Every structure is written in C-alpha cells, then in structure tokens.
Amino acid sequence: DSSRRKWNKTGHAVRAIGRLSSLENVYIMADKQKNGIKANFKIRHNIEDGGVQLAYHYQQNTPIGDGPVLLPDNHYLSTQSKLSKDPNEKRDHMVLLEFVTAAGITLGVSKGEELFTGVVPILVELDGDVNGHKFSVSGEGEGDATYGKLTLKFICTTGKLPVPWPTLVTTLVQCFSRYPDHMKQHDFFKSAMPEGYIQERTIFFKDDGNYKTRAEVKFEGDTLVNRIELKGIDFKEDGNILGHKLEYNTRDQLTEEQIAEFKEAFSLFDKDGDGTITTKELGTVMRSLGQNPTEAELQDMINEVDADGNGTIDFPEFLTMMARKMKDTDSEEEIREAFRVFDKDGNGYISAAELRHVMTNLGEKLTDEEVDEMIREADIDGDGQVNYEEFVQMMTA
Ligand SMILES: [Ca+2]
Ligand SMILES: [Ca+2]
Ligand SMILES: [Ca+2]
Ligand SMILES: [Ca+2]
C-alpha cells in the first residue's frame, strides 16, 4: 500500500511539527524571593481505551538550610519513565525505572554535587488523602545521577491505592537528574544538599480534581529521603482518577517499522541529507504547510528537543522526540489542529483538492490519480472526502 505510506510520512511530519510546537519538558526558573526555584510542566496520562488525561503541574522549591545554593538560568529537564510490575509481589505496587537529563541551554559544580558521584540509596514515604480516601506509600531503591538514573519500587502499605499509580510518579527526587557539563552551575537541587529542600506542588487534573503536595528531600545518613504529604480534593468518584481509568503500562513500543517511518519523516526535513535538521530546514517545511515562523520561533522549537545544545535537531534527537510523541496521546485540540493543516477551508472534510494542495506544497510529486488513491484509502463512508473521524483513523498507529 503506497497510499497508506504517503499518509504515514505526511502525518508524521505534521506530528513532528506538532511536537516541536509543544512544551513537554519540565521548565525550571530561578525564584530569588525564596532563594530557590519554581517550575511548571504538564503530564499526559493515557486513558484506557483511548484519549489523554492532562495533569498541569506548578512547583516551587526552597532550601532547608542557610548555606549558599545555585540559582539557575531558565532550562528544562527531560524524562523517560518505564513502569512495570514485580511478578512475585502480591501487594499493590509500582516498579519504576527513570532517566532524567537537563537541557535547554545552548552550547557556548557545587559541593552538594559531590554527594551524587556514585550510587545513592533512596527512601520515599508518602501519606495521601484524596477526597477523604487515605493511603500511604513507601518506596526504596537507588539513584545514579551520573546517568540521571533512578530505580525504585513502591508499595501501597495501606492496601489498595485509591488513585492510579501513574498519577503519583511526579510526586514520588530531582537531585538525581543528569546536568551536562555546560549546565552544572544551574543545578539547584544538588546544591541544596545534604541539608535539602522543601518541594511543593499543585497538580491540576483537567476536568477533574487537583493534588496539593509538600515534600522534604534531604539526606538522612547516607540515604536520600523524600517525605511527602499529599492532599487531593474536588475529584469525581467516577472520573479517570478515582475510577481507575488510566493505563498503567508504559506503551514504549517502537517497532523497527515505526523507526523506519520516523526516518522517512526526518528526511522530509533533512533535505540536504546531512543527518541533522537546521532552523532553515524546519522553516522551509513549515512554510510549505502554510505557516510562517520567525527565526526566534524556529530556534525555540529546536531548543525544546535539542539534547546536546548544538542548535540543530540531530537524527537521534528526532527519534527521541518522536518516540515521546507516539508514547503519549494528543488532546482533541491538538488532533483538530493537525486536521486543519489539511482541511484548509474548515468545513470538516478534506477534499481531493485540499490533499492535492498539501502534497504538492511538500514537493511530493503526485498524479491526480495518486491523490485520489490516498483519499480512497482513508475514505471510510465513501463520500469522496476525509472527515475528522476518518483522519483520526489514518493517523493512529
Ligand atoms: Ca540537514
Ligand atoms: Ca542537537
Ligand atoms: Ca475542507
Ligand atoms: Ca468520507
């Protein structure tokens, strides 16, 4: 099927631009008034059987001790988590593997960091109360900040956890993040150790309640300990949280067929075939789709996924951002936005002339018959056009 592969390539390009235009990282900034930092970010929780539950986080951290700390320039953390189960464990539990790296400062170490050069034991204790449903969680494992690596197992010590495990991941030690060499002066978290910091958040679950958390993170002997209280209010008993409607298992697939699909979209951008995407190349493709980014906007889009800070999107960086984009689910607003890239006139239907316009602009030399074949592959009800629902099915993996 040459039609379905043209949909895939084009769809992945639109999806790539979507990711580049989104803010998916953990954004950190100095909070001078508190001698610390604040942060904001959003988490996408896959809903079982379809859709996304958004969780908007606001965070602030303040040192526990009076020693000097590092106040960072603006930057972000980028995370990769894998949730699993221990087959021998009968209690309600979560096994967590996590890698976290700082970035967001283009190219061109505190005493506290010394405590993190090797493997450090971790303890986590959480008491929670969500809509009056109380619970406790205890966790243990270790952190290896050299690689930004955490391995932890958590148990609900009160029996059944009344909220989905994924909703507690962000609450359950950012001092283990890997900061690159050129960003070591921006690592507040380690700079506050061993005395530690207080971390507070409010977490807004869209169309549902919110969590309020306060935690003390500090060394107790040789162990890095995170002690947390969590209070949730305003939840719907039958919502995605209290109703346990969120996926547990990390959907970190990535067939080699999918990686190949990603590479095809990569090469639409990488038109000189040197294995990296520049602002110039990104701008070219966006304009072809009817957009008009400034140079500053293009730099910012690249910076959002530019792991090594060299100002371009390298092939491995592109694979990484696309993996994240496919792992997580897009919102209805985001999908409709992609739909509108094709549905130029906004009547709810992608016509042959509209599809032709897009493919032609992307430099895809396609005959009028080829376009027709594309429409047909997607045209479910047979009306000779592609409606939202049919577009969605073409875009879903
Ligand atoms: Ca290139
Ligand atoms: Ca790069
Ligand atoms: Ca239309
Ligand atoms: Ca149709």
Side-chain angles (χ1 to χ4, degrees):
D1 191 5
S2 186
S3 280
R4 178 159 201 82
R5 115 193 226 274
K6 283 171 183 48
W7 278 107
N8 270 59
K9 172 181 176 174
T10 296
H12 278 142
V14 179
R15 183 194 325 280
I17 288 166
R19 170 61 188 97
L20 290 170
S21 308
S22 305
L23 298 167
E24 304 296 318
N25 305 321
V26 176
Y27 305 99
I28 297 176
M29 60 226 72
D31 188 356
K32 178 62 168 173
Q33 298 190 224
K34 307 289 180 62
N35 193 30
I37 60 155
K38 61 178 78 158
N40 69 98
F41 55 100
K42 72 163 177 289
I43 297 299
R44 297 168 185 267
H45 297 293
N46 289 346
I47 299 165
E48 274 288 323
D49 306 312
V52 63
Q53 171 66 65
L54 299 171
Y56 290 88
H57 286 60
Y58 292 101
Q59 172 182 338
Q60 57 183 56
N61 295 55
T62 186
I64 288 175
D66 301 303
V69 297
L70 296 175
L71 303 182
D73 289 347
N74 291 5
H75 67 282
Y76 60 73
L77 306 175
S78 166
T79 71
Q80 207 170 327
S81 297
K82 174 55 169 189
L83 303 207
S84 56
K85 299 294 191 181
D86 170 354
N88 296 330
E89 180 59 67
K90 293 173 167 303
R91 295 166 295 180
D92 199 350
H93 75 285
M94 173 176 69
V95 176
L96 177 61
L97 171 62
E98 206 157 69
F99 292 87
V100 184
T101 307
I105 294 180
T106 53
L107 291 166
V109 41
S110 77
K111 174 185 184 66
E113 176 152 6
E114 296 178 4
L115 302 178
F116 292 88
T117 53
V119 177
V120 176
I122 299 173
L123 284 170
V124 181
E125 289 172 1
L126 169 53
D127 288 325
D129 180 334
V130 175
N131 277 216
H133 299 107
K134 295 171 68 162
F135 65 92
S136 292
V137 166
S138 68
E140 51 79 29
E142 63 191 28
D144 193 359
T146 299
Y147 304 114
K149 178 182 165 179
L150 298 170
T151 51
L152 294 143
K153 176 177 170 190
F154 299 93
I155 294 290
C156 178
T157 53
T158 45
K160 184 180 179 44
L161 192 69
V163 297
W165 279 107
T167 70
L168 298 182
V169 174
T170 59
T171 298
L172 296 159
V173 288
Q174 288 171 316
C175 47
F176 289 101
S177 310
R178 181 178 81 81
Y179 277 70
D181 286 50
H182 68 111
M183 293 178 58
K184 300 286 192 184
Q185 70 270 46
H186 306 293
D187 187 350
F188 161 85
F189 308 101
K190 294 188 190 55
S191 82
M193 297 294 163
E195 305 82 4
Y197 51 78
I198 303 292
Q199 172 163 304
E200 294 177 293
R201 294 214 181 91
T202 303
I203 304 173
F204 290 97
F205 294 88
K206 186 169 182 172
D207 301 313
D208 212 335
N210 61 72
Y211 294 162
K212 208 255 248 203
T213 70
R214 180 180 190 282
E216 296 197 3
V217 184
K218 76 191 173 188
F219 278 89
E220 290 172 22
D222 66 338
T223 303
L224 189 287
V225 184
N226 179 23
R227 301 176 187 281
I228 314 150
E229 59 182 297
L230 177 154
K231 162 74 95 160
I233 64 178
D234 289 357
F235 286 87
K236 298 167 178 186
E237 274 298 338
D238 62 314
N240 298 319
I241 288 81
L242 293 175
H244 296 278
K245 307 191 186 170
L246 300 183
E247 287 185 2
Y248 175 84
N249 278 124
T250 306
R251 68 174 201 194
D252 56 358
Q253 194 66 184
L254 283 196
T255 306
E256 283 180 1
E257 183 199 359
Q258 283 179 312
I259 295 190
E261 296 178 15
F262 293 164
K263 181 159 86 170
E264 201 162 338
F266 177 84
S267 296
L268 177 72
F269 295 94
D270 180 31
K271 292 188 192 299
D272 68 3
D274 77 343
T276 201
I277 295 161
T278 61
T279 58
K280 175 170 199 168
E281 287 174 321
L282 177 54
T284 301
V285 173
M286 292 176 76
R287 286 184 298 266
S288 292
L289 290 174
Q291 299 170 99
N292 199 28
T294 60
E295 177 72 13
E297 286 179 331
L298 293 161
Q299 285 176 332
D300 284 352
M301 288 171 73
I302 290 187
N303 199 51
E304 163 80 3
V305 304
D306 180 16
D308 73 353
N310 76 345
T312 66
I313 307 172
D314 298 284
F315 182 55
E317 291 168 350
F318 185 93
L319 295 184
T320 297
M321 97 183 183
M322 296 293 292
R324 172 70 168 231
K325 188 63 178 181
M326 297 292 299
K327 176 183 180 295
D328 285 1
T329 301
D330 291 336
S331 73
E332 169 168 20
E333 293 75 33
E334 287 157 350
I335 301 171
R336 292 207 155 269
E337 200 171 33
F339 182 66
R340 291 303 313 270
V341 169
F342 300 84
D343 183 4
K344 301 289 193 197
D345 74 31
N347 70 352
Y349 297 90
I350 307 165
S351 69
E354 271 162 348
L355 186 43
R356 205 195 322 288
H357 172 93
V358 170
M359 302 301 271
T360 296
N361 280 144
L362 286 170
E364 303 281 306
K365 301 178 179 181
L366 294 195
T367 62
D368 286 359
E369 208 282 330
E370 282 182 307
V371 177
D372 280 6
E373 217 316 69
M374 281 192 72
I375 295 295
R376 286 194 296 269
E377 176 56 48
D379 184 3
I380 285 181
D381 58 25
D383 74 358
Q385 294 189 300
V386 183
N387 66 17
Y388 182 73
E389 298 72 28
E390 293 161 343
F391 173 83
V392 168
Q393 292 306 313
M394 286 292 340
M395 297 288 106
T396 59

